[PDB]
């Protein structure tokens, strides 16, 4: 996020971070309930990867975070790599997420759901803050 | 990459006015936003785009691509959840 502000901690409870076995954050993800994370298909997540939840400060050691293991990866079969069209991969968790004051689910819209141009919305993450 | 979690408010645009930018790169299953002075950027992918609807935050996009320079003047392109919820909804059933 270029120009974002720091979030209040635990204010975005469905935000998870995908990290490799190295510990390196490379994509975000959103908790859809306790066994299922949504992320991007281009993120190219495998099962040597992990779902970290309840994280605020990537650099803090004193955080009660949850390191969650991936069971199975579900790349939407209409995903198109040539276009990055339909860039949605579900993640099935081997380990249930323990919901709490800081770990929870976002809501999914109806296929029907309307969301109008001009409407102010919000995006979060741990991406480059200056490029 | 920042250590702690960032946030930004930003407006959604019509695909149509988006096409102004991405031309024929923008597919129905894609939803635009930004060009507001904020930008999503490398490392933010797979992450959340939320809108408030009737008390709750509802997944509206998934950070997918855009500018290679993370230009706050060009819109980011997100997955359009509306168009993939049927498939998600479905995947949940068989597992």
């Amino acid at each position: 996020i270029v120009n974002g502000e720091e979030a209040v901690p635990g204010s975005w409870p469905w935000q998870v971070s995908l990290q490799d076995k190295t510990g390196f954050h490379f994509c975000g993800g959103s908790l859809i309930n306790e066994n299922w994370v949504v992320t991007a298909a281009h993120c190219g997540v495998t099962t040597s990867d992990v779902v970290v939840a309840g994280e605020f400060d990537q650099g803090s050691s004193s955080e009660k975070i949850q390191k969650l293991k991936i069971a199975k990866v579900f790349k939407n079969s209409k995903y198109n790599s040539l276009t990055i069209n339909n860039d949605i991969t579900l993640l099935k968790l081997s380990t249930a997420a323990s919901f709490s004051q800081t770990v929870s689910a976002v809501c999914l819209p109806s296929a029907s759901d309307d969301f109008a141009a001009g409407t102010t919305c919000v995006t979060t993450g741990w991406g480059l803050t200056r490029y | 990459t920042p250590d702690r979690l960032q946030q930004a408010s930003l407006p959604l645009l019509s695909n149509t006015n988006c096409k102004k930018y991405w031309g024929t790169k923008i597919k129905d299953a894609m939803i635009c936003a930004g060009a507001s002075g904020v930008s999503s950027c490398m490392g933010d992918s797979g992450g959340p785009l939320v809108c408030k609807k009737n008390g709750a935050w509802t997944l509206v996009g998934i950070v997918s691509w855009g500018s290679s320079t993370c230009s706050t003047s060009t819109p980011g392109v997100y997955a359009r959840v509306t168009a993939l919820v049927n498939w998600v909804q479905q995947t949940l059933a068989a597992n």
Partner: peptide, 10 residues
């Protein structure tokens, strides 16, 4: 779903 235990500040 969707309503934090900790409310976000913008």
């Amino acid at each position: 779903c969707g309503v934090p235990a900790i409310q976000p500040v913008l």
